[PDB]
Every structure is written in structure tokens, then in C-alpha cells.
Design a protein around this ligand. Sequence first.
Ligand SMILES: [Mn+2]
Ligand SMILES: [Mn+2]
Ligand SMILES: [Mn+2]
Ligand SMILES: [Mn+2]
Ligand SMILES: [Mn+2]
Ligand SMILES: [Mn+2]
Ligand SMILES: [Mn+2]
Ligand SMILES: [Mn+2]
Ligand SMILES: [Mn+2]
Ligand SMILES: [Mn+2]
Lengths: 377, 377, 377, 377, 377
Amino acid sequence: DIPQPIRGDKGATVKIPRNIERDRQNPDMLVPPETDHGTVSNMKFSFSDTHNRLEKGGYAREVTVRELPISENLASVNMRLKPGAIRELHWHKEAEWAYMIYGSARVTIVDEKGRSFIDDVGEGDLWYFPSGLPHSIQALEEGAEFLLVFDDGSFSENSVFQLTDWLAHTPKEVIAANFGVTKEEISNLPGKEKYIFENQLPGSLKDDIVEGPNGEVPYPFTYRLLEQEPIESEGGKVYIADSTNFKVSKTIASALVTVEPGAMRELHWHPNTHEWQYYISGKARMTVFASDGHARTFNYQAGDVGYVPFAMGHYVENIGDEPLVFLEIFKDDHYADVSLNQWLAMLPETFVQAHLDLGKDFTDVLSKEKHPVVKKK
Amino acid sequence: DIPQPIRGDKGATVKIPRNIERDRQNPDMLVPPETDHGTVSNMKFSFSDTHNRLEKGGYAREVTVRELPISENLASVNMRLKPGAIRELHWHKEAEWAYMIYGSARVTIVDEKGRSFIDDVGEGDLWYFPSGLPHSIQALEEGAEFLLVFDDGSFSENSVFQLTDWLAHTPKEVIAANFGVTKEEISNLPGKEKYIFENQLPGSLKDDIVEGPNGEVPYPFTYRLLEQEPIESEGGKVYIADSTNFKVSKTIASALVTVEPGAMRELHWHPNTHEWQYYISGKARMTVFASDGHARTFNYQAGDVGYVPFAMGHYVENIGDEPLVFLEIFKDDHYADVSLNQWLAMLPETFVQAHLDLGKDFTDVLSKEKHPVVKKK
Amino acid sequence: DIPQPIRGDKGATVKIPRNIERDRQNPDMLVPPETDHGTVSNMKFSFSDTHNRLEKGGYAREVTVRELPISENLASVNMRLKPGAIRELHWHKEAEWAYMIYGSARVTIVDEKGRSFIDDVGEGDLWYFPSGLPHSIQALEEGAEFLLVFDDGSFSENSVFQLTDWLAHTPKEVIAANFGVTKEEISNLPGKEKYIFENQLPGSLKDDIVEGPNGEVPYPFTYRLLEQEPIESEGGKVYIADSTNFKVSKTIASALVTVEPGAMRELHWHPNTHEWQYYISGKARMTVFASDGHARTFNYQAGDVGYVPFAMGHYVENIGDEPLVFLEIFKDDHYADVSLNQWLAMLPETFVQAHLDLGKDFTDVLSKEKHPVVKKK
Amino acid sequence: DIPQPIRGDKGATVKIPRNIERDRQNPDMLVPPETDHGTVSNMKFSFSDTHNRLEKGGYAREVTVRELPISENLASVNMRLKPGAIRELHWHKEAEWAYMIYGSARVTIVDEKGRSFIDDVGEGDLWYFPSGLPHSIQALEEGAEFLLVFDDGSFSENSVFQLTDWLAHTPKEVIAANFGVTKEEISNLPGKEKYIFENQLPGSLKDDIVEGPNGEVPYPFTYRLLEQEPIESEGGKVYIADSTNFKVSKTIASALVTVEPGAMRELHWHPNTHEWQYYISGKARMTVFASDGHARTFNYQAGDVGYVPFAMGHYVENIGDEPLVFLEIFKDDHYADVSLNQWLAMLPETFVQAHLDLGKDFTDVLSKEKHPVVKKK
Amino acid sequence: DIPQPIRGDKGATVKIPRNIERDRQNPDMLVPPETDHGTVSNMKFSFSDTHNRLEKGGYAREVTVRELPISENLASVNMRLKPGAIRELHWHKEAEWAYMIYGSARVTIVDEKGRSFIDDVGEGDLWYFPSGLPHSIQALEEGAEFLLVFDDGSFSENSVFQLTDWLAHTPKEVIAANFGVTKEEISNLPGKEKYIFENQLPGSLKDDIVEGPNGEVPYPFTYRLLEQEPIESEGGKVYIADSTNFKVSKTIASALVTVEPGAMRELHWHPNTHEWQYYISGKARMTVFASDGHARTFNYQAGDVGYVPFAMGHYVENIGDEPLVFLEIFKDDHYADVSLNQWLAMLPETFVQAHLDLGKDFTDVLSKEKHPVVKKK
Ligand SMILES: [Mn+2]
Ligand SMILES: [Mn+2]
Ligand SMILES: [Mn+2]
Ligand SMILES: [Mn+2]
Ligand SMILES: [Mn+2]
Ligand SMILES: [Mn+2]
Ligand SMILES: [Mn+2]
Ligand SMILES: [Mn+2]
Ligand SMILES: [Mn+2]
Ligand SMILES: [Mn+2]
């Protein structure tokens, strides 16, 4: 049945040709809360609304500042590899964070000391490659699909440094001299980058491990986020990974949040930096509060990127029947938040009472323990 | 049936939760043309993906640079008034262009010489209010729904100058002194802006006309675009309105394009400025060609804003069953384009032949007459 | 008696209408030193020349980059609370530093671990709230007046995040769900921010202290600057507070300087960052030396903000009859300066002699001990 | 013999490895005039110091803001075509100005009204293609070498819009539909841009001329600069071409200056805009005077680009044995200059005398007639 | 013999007046590698192409962002002092790094604690003065010539803070008061900066050392780079100095590289920051690879500054008969690089094989030990 932008006696029927399907996806936007007010930048964008780069062995599509101007510090790729397919050995200026949503893959990485690290990554695992270190991904028997996050919003999947593209653009004489071979011995180097290519499934991880004169890396570039004990509350759970626990992960701080139906990520903000969001599954609404009485509510579902500017107040409410599952990303060495609840709970009852024009009956429910996700009892 | 991002042996099935509805709306994006390549900014955005401001008597929602960063020079509002509802008397820095999609409305405007202009606007009509001149809209018995375009992408519907908001923020003594009345005589001024408000239907246009010491305005601020004889070709028609014919319309140049099914707005570019697009009805695809072999294809349908950076090559192909109807907007005193066809048609056969590695059989079909929209005979 | 901009045979009488009162306040500007030269940005601005925001229970006025463009990194509020008046619970992006000039007040603050800190602040005390942590001020029986400094010059007192303003702009359903109460139980929440409001005087500090599951904060957010032993010299004293001693105070470094009549803050610069100044009492002049022989002298008195760009040479001379008292603020984790005197004192006599075309009689007076404020013996 | 940076008792011998060849080319830079002073941006750059793009049939190298940051408004290409070689049909955002130094070539251009213009260009001729209009160059039996100037310093020869590159990046179906042919009929379109390619010499100009439904262009896009009577003075001559005489040339104003040995382009400035310079032959020095007593002298010879910021005082002195020949380019609809000489000549003798502390003997030589190039009698 | 920009059947003879001398210096630019492609910023600039500031006792010339826009973070001075000549006591915002190419000199520096450090510096030695600390240089009996690097590309040698220039622009009364002398006692202070001046040779270093109330500096501001054991490979050696070994050197990381004829600095990049280069002696070529298949080759020799943007792939090949010697500078607390060779050497043979379409015969030569400079055996 057709929704209309009408709230009480405000609003009216749409009379011109419209996108009913999207109107349906965005109820709190066709009909915002009465408490919404003023202008805020766009805080939502769908991967389905982006050009998809198709290759032999997979695909990559991106959400960058070119799509979502508010996110100047952070950009993202949704990438897919078919079984055995290789995302070509490459590097880039930006540091890279990743979450494996579907399947598994082997990654390689070499650090600035000539040490290589090679690991398999399963669903619910992260990896993090520091700025400038060369790496690669190769999916296993199930193939693989994942989210990449880069710590610069100007990033583009099409302007990364590929191994073969470097070679093809280096004088043969110089390549030959570099390795001490003849020109002929390298006559067959690719004349073009590969980016993503089909390849036979890799062997066992153990058969791949390369030891060297310089020894093991100090710290691993992969982390089993879902093997961690989550912060658990009534309405759901939160799995945090930042530099304090996922050691190499210096420029990216993360939390995977799961929200039961009827639950919600509570009212809070972040006193460190901006929040970048990706929605893995479910349906949500968020109101971002930007001060000076400016406030706007966005709807999100699977494949949607979201965003909360530094310190803006928000909440994430599950408005669907299925679990709501999303990521919280920050460009920072740690996760941090202030809970509205915990905050007031830690101040004198009467002081809070004087602020809210409410009484004991309200301050009584305040809780000093933090519960990031609560249920609608 | 479910679409997948697969083209020949490139691409793969989506394995993670997805937005199938949007995937369906964007076929040429889930599966771009093989000839697409490289990165281009986002050139498409839907009004359905924006917060809608609901008032008593209508609504307004906007697409600004905050949503579509590529469009720094141009922004847009989709506004709706219920019958008799008034968009409050107001002004702003930006010049304003408008197209009446549904219904009709009376507008008023006063110029820098103290001359007022008052007209009724029907479907297919435009108006254009020069930077800084105060105006208002009032819908008639059918109500009204229209598109507004402003010649600065930083524009926001929420930061316009409203009559009552000015007064409420002016010292009463000063207001009283200004008009030579007492404070009491204006005690009842609104304490708040109205923005949009319900009101009884207006009388006849003739009963409203105000004459003054300074006489008629030199030129009208409304234009009957659809009363013009269109440039007509096989596949459809083009109705142009720019400063050369719609005289006051100095900073905005416009064309309403209608494209029969199986037809297409031909291959061309614009040698003056950027193109801002709004899609009134139908389904389309456009490829924007950005040089250095960069090219990207976007899908559009009703409620969608589009965009082509200065001189980028494009075409607009109807890929639907119904007529395709859209606006072309420029920040310029005239419309202008170069037709690929007409271009080659006006050069030596053999010269063109030498360029395209084709022969007479191709140059023979070239046409020196411009046909902006052609059919698939 | 009327001052004129005449120096020897340079300058002339003012012949047009003028501001004699200001001319009097700015002697070294109507008549600069002969050694002044070239253009420098404006380095002085008076709080008396700003719009004052008046509320029930106090006032706030600000000096931001909008008033003093040279100060891009730092901005300031002069705030006043009547006895018992509360500056509403709030937070903001910027970190906040403070100096209590008159009276006293209770502050509260909660950190990112859900720990609250509550303290009373008297004259000559500082507080420092890290970016993003929620806080509040409540004046005691004497009321309170203080200076706030924020580590971004784009700061505005009117765009802070207020508790009640957040709530009023959050859907009631969501608020209710957040705390697990009914809509009715919060029906009486303020429909508007309070910002500053009248309230009964608070109880004892001890009765207010809130303990919690997470324990005491590691470090206090208040510092008794005047209880410290000052660096004392002949002409006056300097009380420094930076991250090395006021531990939480990571982004702001400070010094309160007192200068007897006939004394002066010596010739120096700062090799770390810019200097932001506030003048609490007295009359001063400063010459800022900007290299390339550019130099300009400014006059300052109570209520005046001043400023010295990174590494520019300066001095602060008391030119009044009463003590001169001012603050030195830096956006940095430590205070640091180079004394011209100490500098030359630590180099070979003859080397210095060769530089200044002076002799032993001059190098003899140089001192290796730093004396930040000297007297005119 | 080896030059050293020594002037009187200032300076010293170079003691580290050096570029003697360049030192020789830059005498007034190794050893500037005593009257030089302070910092000025770099005002000189050599085409020999740029990467040269080599193609089949010629080459192109550029000087852009990426090489010469002071020139933000203007950039340049030095292009070379072998006999019959075609610079591929193309267009771009920037307007283009040109001077034929060696040989000749046929150009084509189509305007926004579908009118084509086709002309042959010889040595000493200019052309000017307005922003966005498609064009091409084809050298004749002698081949051709010329200078291109573009009215944006961000221009790059590698990011122009090529005909074939557009087609190769347009869906075949869409191309086919555009022209009403089959896919097969265009199967043989180039899969890649050509940029510059070898081709047989063109026929007579008359055999190439294409008439059309829309008639002759209003004005020609080529101008015989050297067929004009030059402003002639003792030391040389000046050939000006701007919008007042070369009608289409709206955004570019030009002058070809020839300076006999012992002569010099007199002391002057330009009260409209910046000056961009190219040196065709000879050796010169220029001092640019930037006010605040800042002044710097540059040496120039064949292949060198130069530059004078808006209104900066300068002169161009021939310091070689051969004629000095260079271009003066402006981004403006007209050429204009103020002659120092003419200026003083038009003011009261005694007034000028009072300024320069000279007497009648000096004012007597002043001349009211402008002589842009004077000789050292 | 005359070089021409011809490669196989690409390119053509230059037909217009040209700079053959530079053409000769830039072989890989007149005739780039076939593998070069696309646009890159300018990465090369010669000190011989700059205005030289001549003083009594030496000279200074600079390469700043005003000459080389790509280098926004880093600028450089080539300075020369005659025996006993003093670069006047001064300070500046920027931190300063230095390499002594010819001769020796005494430097002085005072830190923020009033501690002075005084040392003699010989060929192959570095010094590093932290932002804002006052210093000076005085050459010994041989005179001195060195390279200075400053950690801001906007730096200008003409806008430094000089001791005497400060004094001359400070009111005499204030100077007198500062030191507690009379105006007369300082009547003879220079009325102008000195910048560089002639002076008698200094005594022994030991006679100059100044002790003070505050003791020795924690760490020395000079470092004997060439006394270190170099990383030595077949083709040459690398001497690294960064914050890990040259302790005070916090914002600048450095390496002196020497390359035998027939050798080359291997294929690598830097995963931390940009590379700024200075060429001390020899002839080289470098190709910088900028991704998206963009690549450009530059020629360098003595007196040339070079540059590699963050993470761009490069190599430095000696193309001369004499040793090639150059500096690598970074704005960072450590040196770091990734070797292409070492990188592939640390990954599974077959994985690498699958990337390069080569076989065992190639992976066999890969080496896990890093060899920064290799020879053409
Ligand atoms: Mn990557
Ligand atoms: Mn959050
Ligand atoms: Mn309007
Ligand atoms: Mn168009
Ligand atoms: Mn605050
Ligand atoms: Mn100071
Ligand atoms: Mn062109
Ligand atoms: Mn000129
Ligand atoms: Mn220095
Ligand atoms: Mn390197």
C-alpha cells in the first residue's frame, strides 16, 4: 500500500511521478519524526547505487567521498572473489581495514622489515594492513565477499598500485638490471595490470608459509573478532576491535553490533572522532543530532553506508523483524563512547532532576552500568 | 527474477545481504557496459533518498551539494503546496528557476525598482526570480507540485530569508518606527516564521494586480515553455528556454526533453558549462565520458537528479516502455550543444574516414541537420 | 587632553570626526614606535566589542576567529553565572580550558569510562575538559565569572551540544525505549534547551559526590594554579600549568603572568606554537616582530584578547600604574619559551659582541638564569 | 671560462659539484643585479626540462601549473606534427590559442551552431578555438611546429577529449542506435584513441571546404598576425592580436615582440591581468618588480616560458647578439600596458622632478608618444 | 652531436629554436622510455635555475614550493660561507636539517631550557635544529658549503628571524629596559639585519664552550653520518640517519646514497611519506610510477632537486661514468622502504609465478636479503 508524506495535518500526497520502492525503504524520511529539524549533510548511501567493476574472478564497488561528501576521512569497497580468484598483489597510501562477511581467503603481507605474514581469514574475521605495505587476497573453495575500509575518503579502487602495472611501466632494461637477468628472461611479463584474476585454489596454509632472515612479524595482521567475548546486553551484543586489542590496527577502530528485533543501540555519542557505518543486515533508523536544534533521521538496510560526524548524538533502532547487524568504524587508535544513560546516572539525582523537569521516578531507572544495546521490555 | 553482477565471464553472484530493489532499478550499474572504465564522481541522486520537510499545507525536500558533491553550482527543491497553501513571502541570495509539474499557482515578485509582478503558473510553465528579489507562491484549487533550481549548490531550503522571521528578529521599536505606527498596532505580529501555511484559495488574478508609481516590469517572470513550438525529431522533442527567449532568465538555461520508447537523446556535449538533470518520468541510462578513457553509466528514473560535468560526452537512452521526460539545466545565459553526428557530418568524408577506420558506407549516413533525439528504426 | 598621531615631524592632527576615547586607550597605535614597520595581522580584540548573550542567571560573550581571524586554533568565552545558576549540562567537539577570575563554582564531568568527577573551583583555579566529555558549571553563593578557552577558533557558544536540546529533538518513542519508561513518564521534558538557568544554591560538595562501578578518575579535572609556587623575578611572577603538571590538560598549555608597574615580561618567543592572550587587569603594550623587518605594537587592557603567531618575537610591558595581569595560552602539551637574554648569555662573549657591534660592557650584563619578568631599576 | 657568483665583494666561488652549463645560461641569476631583493615566485621554465610525449607523426610537451605554479590561469603545449600527420579530432574545456612557428597546417572547427570552418595556417599565423568547440590540426608538406596556449593552468595534454576515445568507451548498441546503423557496420571502430597519427598529405583547401544548412561562421578562427602593420619603434616591433582585432579571440590577448640587439622592451606593466611569456629565439633578461621593494631578475632563451604577475613592473632586455623574439599572452579581451616613460611624460615637469630628485635635463627626454621597444643609442 | 626526440618510428626532429644543452642533460625526457605514460607533476628542479642571494661572506639560494609545487612539505637552501663568515644568529618556525658537502663550520644552538650546544661540523656531517630554537653557523679556515632542508615547502631564506633585525625593530626604551642598561649603552646596535657577514676566524672549539646553570643538553645536534658503517651492497652503499640513531632529528629522516657506475638504487617505494632528493654528484635517471599506469622518467645531475610522492614506485639508475651520490630526505621519525625484490622473495614461488607469467627460473633469483643498491653483473 502506498505511503504518503503526511504527518497529522502536516504534509501532503505526492502528485508527481515518484519512486515508491525507495519511499518504502525510507519511511522515516518520507515522514520524518516531528522532532527532526533543520539541515544536516547526507548521512546515508547505498552500494547498490554505485557502478560495479566486473573482472574475471569477481567484482569491486566503492563508496567514497565522491558519493558521500560528509565522509572525508574514510572510504569503502565491497569486494567479491570467486573461488581461487586473486586480488592482485598491490599497495596504496591508505591503511586498510577489513571484515569478512562471506567465505574465506588467504592474505599475504610484507612489512617494512622484509617480513611476510600469511593467514587464512574466515567469516567474522578482520584484517588490517598499515599504510603502504604490499598485500594480496586469495579466496578459498567457497569464494569470498568482504568490506574494505580505507582511512582516506578520497580513495579509489581504480587508483591503487598494482604489481604488474608497475612492472609494465618500468623500462625493461631497468627491470632486467634490478634482478640481474636478461631482457629475454622477462619478455613474458604481463603488458597490463590484472587487478583481479581467476586462479586455481591454493594449497594448505602451512605449505605457503615463508620464513626469512628477519623472522616472524611482531604482531598478526588478522583478528578473530567473533571469537571474542562480546559486551552483551539484553537487546544484543557489541564486538569491539581497536589498537588496544587488535594491535596493528592503529588508524582504525571498530565494533560489530548486533541488535535483536525490538532492541536498539542506545543513545550516545563519540568524544574522539566521526563514525562511519556499514549495514550488513536488517532495517534501522538513526537520528543524528547536530546541535543548535538541528536533527535528522535516516533509514538504513543491507548494503547501506551511514555516518555520524564527530560527537553528534545518535541511536540505532531496529525497526525490522530480523536481527539488525552493522559495523561502527572510527579513524582512531581506540573505541570510545558516552552513554546518555550512564552519564546522567553518574550525576546527582536532583541536579539531573533540575535539568529535565522530571522527578525521582525517572532518575530511579538510570543505570551506572553501561548497556550499549537495550530491549523494549 | 534476481539480477546478478555478471557479464560474460566477468563478475559473480552477490553472496552478502543486498538491496535487490535498487539493484533492479540500476541494471547498467550492477552490470555496467563493457566499455565503462575508471572512476567518475557520482552523477545521480534520488529525492526519495532525502529528508522531507513537512508543513501545514505542503512539503519541501532538497538535493544539494551536501547530497551530490559534483554539483557545486546548482541545487534543487521538490516542493508541494496544498490548495490555497502559501509558500511564505521570502527572498534569498540565489537566483531561482522553476518548472510546474503538477497543478497551478500564483506567484508574486517585486524588482529593485519597486515594481511588482503577479502571475498564474500552470503545468509546463516556468518562472525565474533573479537573485535577491522577494517572492512567494500560492497554489490554486488543484494544489501544486514543482521543481525549484537554485544557482548555488550550497543552497538550503532551511536557510532562506522569510518575511515574518525577519520581523520577529527586529526590535519592535524599530519596526514601529519604520512604518510610523505604535508598538501596540503590531503587537500581534507572528513570533515565528511560517514557511508554508494553509490559507483560503485566492481570488481572480485580475483582482490581485497591483499598479504603482513605477509602472509595469520590463519583462515577465513566467514563461509558457510548452506553448512553444519544440525542436521536433523522430524520437521526440526538445523545448528550450534561455536568456535569448525567456528574457529575465539570465543565470539559468533550460530544456525539457521528451523521448519516445526506443528513442534517445543523441550523442553530444555542452561547450559552455555543466549539465544538471531532473527526471520527471520514465527510465533512462546515460554514459558520461570524462576523457582519459574514463567512462561511467548511470540509471535514472522519476525523482532522480543527474549531472554531466562541463563538456563531458553523453547521451540519454530511453530504456523503458513509457515516454522518457527530463529537464536539462545549465548555469549560463544560453543553451548550447555539439552534436557528434552534425560534427562529423560537417567535415571532409575522407578525413572522418581516416579517423574512424570506417568507409563511405558510414559517412553516408551522417547528417548536417541537428536531430537532438533519434529513433531506433 | 587630546592626543594626535604626531611623532617628531612625522604624522599630523586628525581632522575628521574621531574616537578620542579609543585613541586614548591605544597610544602606541595612534603613535606607534618609530621602530614599527610593515603589515601584520590584527593581534588585539576587546570582549566589550562583542554581542553579549543574556540569559536568566547570567551571560556569555565570545571572541572567535570570526572576530580575530589570526586565531584559527583558539577561541574564547567570557561567561558569568549568578548565584546557583547552572550552565546546562552539555558537550562539544572542542577541548575546554578555564580560569576562574571571580567567585566559585561546582563542575561535573563524566569520562569515556563512565566515571564522574565533581569539584568546586575558586578564584585562581583552572579546569580542563577533554574533547567530547559532557560537563556543567554551577556557581555558588558568590556567583561566578570566568574565561573559557576552546582549542578551535571556529567555536561558537551558540553551537554547543545541550542535554535538553538533544532530548527535545529525539523521537519520544526512542527516548522512552532508551530508558525503558512510557511516553507519559517523560511527557514533561523541556521542549527547548535551557543553556543557562536560575536554580537554588547546591548543597555541600561531599553530598554531591557520586561513586560508581568504575571507580575514581585517574586524574582531576581542576587545578589550583595560584596555590603553586610561581617562577618569581624582580618585576613579577609566572604561574605555569601544562600537561606536565596539570595532567589532563593535554591540548592546552597556560601561564598566568603578573607584572608590577615599571616591570615587563621580557623579550622572548615560543618555539612550539602560537600564543593566545587574555588581559585580566592593567594596561600594556606589546610589539610583535614578524621577521622581514615587519613589526607592530598593540595596546591592551582589561577585557582584551591578544595574540602572537608561532615564534614571533615579543615582550609585554606594563605601561600603567597598577599591576598588569594576563594569561598566556598555547595549543600544546607544554609551555616553552626562548629568552633573548638567556640566549645571548649562553654564547661566546665575542661572538655576541661581533653580532651587536657592542662591547664587553654589554655582554657583562647578560644573565644565564631565566628571569621572565624584569623591573626597571 | 667559469662564472662564479661574485659581485664586487659579495658572494663567493661555488665549491660543490655544479651545473656550469645552466650557470652560463643564467648570468643574471648566478649573479643578480645589486638592485634585486627579496623573494618572488619562480617566473621561468624551460620546455627542455619536460617529459616529451612521442607519437607516430609527432610529439607534444607541456608547461603547466604543475611545472610553473605561479601560472594558475594559463598553460602551454609545444607540439610537432610530421608532414600529413593529424592531431586527432578532439575538444576540451579550455579555450585554445596558437602561434605557428614552423611550417603550416590545416585546422578544422565546428561551432555551437553546427557550422564548420576550415583553414590553412602558415608561419606567423594564429588560431583560436573557443572553449568546448571540436577541432583538429593536420600538417602540410613541410610538417609543422607550434605553441598552444590554454586558459587554465591545470590543463594537461593527456586529459583532452578525443573522438575515438569517446567512441571506444560508448556502448556499441548506443553508437549503432545513434547513427541508425548495425553493430557490424561499426565493428571496425578503433578500440583505442589515436591522439596523433601518420596520414597521407591532404588535398587542396578548396576541395575540403564543407558547406551546410547553417551557413558560414560569423568570424574566422585564424589570424595572420605577421601580415599586420606592427607598432614599430627604433629597437623593434610589436604585433598585437586581441578581441578587438582577432574577433573570436575573447579569452586570450597576444603580442609578438621582436627586439634588435642592443634594444629592449621598455619599462611597463599591465593594468588588466598577468603576463605569460614564451621565448621563440634570442637571449633576454627581465626583472620583475613585485612592490614592497621585492625584485628579481630572470634569464630567458629559446624554449623558455616566462611570467609576470598582474601589474608587476618589468622590462625585457635583449642581452644577446641575435634578434630577440617572444610572445606576450594575457587572459583578457584586450591588450593594455602602461609605459613608465609615457606616464611621467604626461605629468607636470616639476611634479615629476619633485618625485625623482632629478631636474629639467631628465624630464626633457620624456616622451608622450609610446615606444614599446627602444634602442641603446 | 644533436639529439632528437625520436624513438623508433615515434617522434620527430625539433624544428624550432631549442635548448640543446638542456636537451643533452635530459636524454630520458627528450626521449622518454616507451613504458612512460600519462601525466605526473614535475619532480625535478635545478639550483642553477634559481636567483642567488649574494652577501659579504657568502651566498644562499633556495628551492621551495614556489619552484617545485609538488614539494609542499619540504624546502631547501644551498648556502655558502667564506672562511670565518657568519650566518647571523637566527631562528624560524621550520625545523632544519643539514649536510656538510664542503669544508667545515661551528654551529651554536640554545634549547628551550636555556642550554647551549656548540660543535664543529666537517664534510659528511649533519646537524638538525628543532623548530624554533635559535642557531648560527660560522665557517672555519676552509670556508664551507652545505645543503639545508626545512620541514615546510613554504619556507623562504628571506623570511627568517634574525637577531639584529628583531632588535632594530624593537623600541630602544624596551630594549634598554629588558637588559637594564641605558639607551646610550646600546646606541650602536646595528640599524639593519646582517644575515651573512665577514668575520675573523673563530678560536678553538674548546675556548668557545659555554657552561651554564642548566647543564649539558640531553643529546647532540650534530651527527657524523659518514663515520657510520653503511649498509653495503655490490653497487654501492647507504648511510641512514633518522630519529632512531640521530636522536634529536625527529621531523627529518635521511639517507646518503652512493652508486657505482653500472649500479642502481633498486626498485622500491616508501610506505611512510614523500621522498625529497638532492643530487650531490653524478648523473641519474628515475622513473616515478604513480599508479593507474601513470609513469614518468626524470634525469638528474649535480645541483638538482628531485622528489617522489608518498609510495610511488621508483629506482635510481646511475647513467654516468662517475659515482652517483645523492640524498634521500623524508619528513618522518624514521626511514623505511619496501624492496620489490625482497617483497616477492618473501611470497610463495608459485603465487609470484602466477602473478608475473614467469617461471621458476625467475623466482630462483629473488633474494630475501635486502640489497638497496645493485650492480649490473
Ligand atoms: Mn588493498
Ligand atoms: Mn555510534
Ligand atoms: Mn524562493
Ligand atoms: Mn546534455
Ligand atoms: Mn563547555
Ligand atoms: Mn609570550
Ligand atoms: Mn586542442
Ligand atoms: Mn609585459
Ligand atoms: Mn637556520
Ligand atoms: Mn626512494
